């Protein structure tokens, strides 16, 4: 029991696991956060390092205006013919009868290399997957989205051959599997093992009814027979289990001939005044990735320890490989590139949003649109990856009107965030303001204004997260800290609290500057510290 | 002679009227509909023709992903120094505490010429206006948006000098006016008349409390004194008046030294089960533009006939100039340019959404995203401009899967529309289906499927609008029509029915093709007929 779940903490959903020789890769979805797709690398399945974010250019991923939790849904990473293949989606509509979005293919020699320009596959449903058949043929699988009023929206798993020569889907698509009574059949993955094709799918939806089902056929077009103890992964029946929403799985065979299953999961905070059987809880870290061990019997896989998953799982018999950290606890912005754990919303980090060279050893952000804007935000943020942490920054900002503000933000989506910002008041001058957006209801709860003396070069801003609650603090000298006595609920930044059709990310913390007057006033952030605690 | 109001019927709001010599122009807002800004031209203020749509390029106007009723809000058209100046906005956020949006300036020698690339002015609030002072200086006015929780969001009218040489606002902005108790102060227009600067604003919001207020100052930065009988325009007090939502005005002095006021208005449909004093009604034609006559007294203008406005208004002493129609009652798509009364949502009409040359004498639309998408819709549409009309098209479409559909659509926004479309059913083949989106609640009300025989070349589709109700009909031969006995309420496509922070357009009817499978299957529309009635 040396794998400790979750292996990817914080917002890291929809894992697509992939072996190349003795290297293991896992791609996860990133939704509106840019650059798109996170690929992690491991030798032993115990330790994982963030290795690449493939979708770096607007020609590969153009998400300006995308709805919250649109963009890059579950991706599929594979390897064949000396190349990585990455299938991804750009979902443009996440609410209502339709689910408009398009599926694309890019390739690369190495996951951290330059990925190709996208090949357009289809638009008929999300969760596309690329299957490399033993014959050399290639097939794309995806769910079929049905908009029609009388029908369940999940109309089955479609299969269609992909022509490498023609760079397009060919022939006609075929519905090969219609799911089980759990329904919401999605996330198709095909595997050829022994004498059967195994079709792995997610069912039940990505909330607390989530499950992984598997079916098998001697022929790729079916009919598929469902596992006799289906589902193979699910925590639906065990509301007290520490792993919840267990589903959307992918399977890997190690180079040591052992079998493992990656799946997403959530770790909810519960309410003491509610029944955990009725209110399963809220997940501010979003959906995380866990790894289970498989065993085989009668040609069917089973999750070792039970289908709800285990926190501690027997690691494969592989030499341990620990990686060095890929971020520093205190980022002083001495590098010319933004650290790989930082992302921006929807669009690339360019000189129109910020600079790492205009003000050396600072991250300079030019004030753009407000935190409610799905277009151009000067906001650089990183995931909450623990229930217990501190994040801190120091900002030089001299606003001249009330429409300019910059500071520290905890953020779920454009309707759900809190921010501690240096702004300007017509009567008191530079002030420190607390802003709260809760499903688009806006409040500024401080009862008395915090005036910033003109002598203060840098305003130090901190958030302290203690599982259920978090609090902001500030200092004018980094020595004497003052806590703002407004206790914020972490569950308000969770998948399970926010309204609307897209609820698939997780809480972020970061640095931000807005100027809704038009002057693009810069804020200079001296450092960003993110430190997990006990 | 008589001006008959509204002079611009259907969705034509926020009029900015402008005289150049003996020609008169009026620009109106277009929100998410592309190309942006409609400019109308008149000689006599009675007859108006659609003359230009300036914002034709994505470099001038990039609205992909824009929210419904974002985009081009109220524009400002002026003329000075031998060129037209157009100030416009691109609003990116229409709900919540902020109103993120940016204001731009483009210029041209003629309203239908090539307009420049935009100069960015500011982002501090919408309704920007450019004022040409007698001193030669230029000033930009706009409202100030206040997001702060404790404050009214309409924080006053800002003034700042614009440097023509430096292509930017210079100096610092000054709040010159904070409004009256009606509040929601917006739409500033400045006029220097006689001994005073006159600041015209809209107040009360663009629903049924709308008003136009006017103030004057000897000095451009104020303080402004409010009109003693303010507001000068409003129907708030008369719920039965045929013109409602009267406000957002602009003033013109004719070359015959007469004074007129253009303003937006709505013409509501009422419910017989409700009090009009409680439910003023619903406006499927959206906000239209009307023109009132002004008279002066003691240095203040007054609307002739009362501040609620008149339907028939005395025309200026100008020789009549009647224009011929600018669209064809039956458009056969024989021309290589889409007629000027057709618009697309958000984006240019390019070879990726349709073509007038691939299939001659047809409008070919490549199936793209559904009607609920704010991104790429292959939808070509024109305004409802009468309470009584018929629209009709004929479509060649051969869908192969249930994710392909094309046909005739009546549309307010991405959440509010109805469509009669040729689609495909796995068991019955090509079928005719009715789809309904009502504030994003989706229904398909036909009780039995309408099967289309394989031999049918064109499916003819028609909508008949009779004020409160509209009904779809279809034919397989253009001779024998079958009405679909599902009565639709016109008020469901109105500013006053749809949910959300943006409710600023009006009902459209048009041709559409979607392919949510990825194959971009084309539908070919043979013609589009739009034929109004006189009640």
UniProtKB/TrEMBL annotation, chain A:
Pfam family membership, one: Glyco_hydro_43
Domain of life: Bacteria
UniProt entry tagged with the keyword Hydrolase: yes
Enzyme nomenclature, EC number: 3.2.1.37
Active-site residues, record numbering mapped to chain: 14, 186
Keyword Isomerase listed: no
Gene3D superfamilies found in the cross-reference section: 2.60.120.200, Glycosyl hydrolase domain, family 43 (2.115.10.20)
Family: Belongs to the glycosyl hydrolase 43 family.
PANTHER family referenced in this protein's UniProt entry, alphabetically: BETA-XYLOSIDASE (PTHR42812), BETA-XYLOSIDASE-RELATED (PTHR42812:SF12)
Name of the protein described by the UniProt record: Beta-xylosidase
